[PDB]
Amino acid sequence: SEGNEGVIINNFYSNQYQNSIDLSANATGSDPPKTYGQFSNLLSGAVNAFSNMLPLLA
Amino acid sequence: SEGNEGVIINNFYSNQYQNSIDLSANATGSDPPKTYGQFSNLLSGAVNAFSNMLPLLA
């Protein structure tokens, strides 16, 4: 059930603050999101296709 | 994300007061409004057309 609290008013602090956050873990693991934000260093020119090419060795 | 604030209530002070105002400047400049208010001194009779005219030199 619930405890000993019987106030009519909506809790002034939201729940994620008033209480701990119950989480549940699934047995088989979970995939991290793909990206944690948009910060990134980028590697360009990695590959090919296009230059002063095919004078270039085989 | 956000910080460490988790109050349900609407901020009592409005934002322009609770926070700084993020503004953004465009590269190419911005035109001042045309007028800053309605205070003004006025120049009248600047030009012509109409009097005891054309007895008046050419």
Add this chain to the structure above:
Amino acid sequence: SPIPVTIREHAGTWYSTLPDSTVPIYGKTPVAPANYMVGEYKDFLEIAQIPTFIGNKVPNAVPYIEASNTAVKTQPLAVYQVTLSCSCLANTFLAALSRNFAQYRGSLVYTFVFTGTAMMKGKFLIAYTPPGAGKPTSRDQAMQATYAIWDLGLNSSYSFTVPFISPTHFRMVGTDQANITNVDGWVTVWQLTPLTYPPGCPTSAKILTMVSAGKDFSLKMPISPAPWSPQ
């Protein structure tokens, strides 16, 4: 625009049992998943129903009573006062649970497990006597109140329920002082017929005694018993 308030006289008090929460200082903390967990209960009533052992022969307590090969109508095998305070119940979960509340209501269940030989035979008279005229002094007087006859045979135990008979809707859990000739009556156990046996068999047997709450049983108003030390 600041709002006007009237400060109540009780400004600044702290109430140990306030129906409200306080200031959170470390929000957004996720917990460690505990979802694999089992065995949870949510109401004490959920487990108050499991029988635990009644202590006989206090302070040299044993979890049983002994039936003999003689039926003296004048001699009870046991006499329990129906009080959640009986020194008899002092270590049952019922009593340990109950001591944290002010009042109870409902059925009490006394369970007897026969532990003698399969070759033994016998009959017991278990009675509940409401208060008013004192405790019964012979099986003949007990037999005048609520009772059951327990016959020994294939089935090992007997569950006797003492009916809640009371003027008030609830009864106080604990005694202030000691409760006289009062309390709420007595559970007395008597032999109807003696334990009988064949040659080559012991002539007395132990009967395990336990107590539990009935489906009826309720407890209300949480408090704290007088503090004690087990030693």
Add this chain to the structure above:
Amino acid sequence: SPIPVTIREHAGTWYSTLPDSTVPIYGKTPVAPANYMVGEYKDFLEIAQIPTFIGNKVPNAVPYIEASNTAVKTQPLAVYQVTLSCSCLANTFLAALSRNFAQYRGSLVYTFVFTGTAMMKGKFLIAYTPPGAGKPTSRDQAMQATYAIWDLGLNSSYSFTVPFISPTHFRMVGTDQANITNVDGWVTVWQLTPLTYPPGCPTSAKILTMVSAGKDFSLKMPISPAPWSPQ
């Protein structure tokens, strides 16, 4: 019409981490546009993934280990304890980040960059040993746990991930005292085959060692480490 209030016992306290704001004294202040700005991040996890250098041979730390022309199964090239407290990790961003939190979870990534000659050849056995039976003492024992064989060739580095193997969902970041024979196990690096080379080439090479968080890695509950002075 003034509203009646009940003042709580905690009246007047200041909470360093209160989930709330205070009084604004200089409103309507526009800022200087900072919209041309780049390089912003928003979560530490965003950069905890970038490998930084592990210190070898403390306190005469060097960012690398040395492979030789001899494979002694009895001699690890390196042994790292898997603790975000290892003096080994003391100056990695992972460790510097982690020291501001109470617990971590997830994958740790040890990256090795071979820096020897192109003419050299060799194979390493990198193993992760969970706790319980102590640290392995020969490549033969390490080989009994989680491990990978790293072959030298065109591709310069090797990224070894130590799997999060733990009874609890999370692990404590820092050590209180020192953690024994504990900690969470060990990463040991061994030579499988010796570094081989042709005539005219050095007979040992440096292997750069770095550490980072895996995509799995998480940190929780911000605190402050014990204060220190870099000098």
Add this chain to the structure above:
Amino acid sequence: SPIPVTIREHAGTWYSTLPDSTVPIYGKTPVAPANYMVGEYKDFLEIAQIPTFIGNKV
């Protein structure tokens, strides 16, 4: 976001007849049913109508 209040001059007074309630300290307590009860009255006027004895020769 904490709300600004103006404290009235009468702060802290206790009024013996205040038209209001105070702090509850032992909630959710069910009572003992008293539904068999009879003879209740709710207004003194309900019984002020029953004659009682005038004292003569005081």
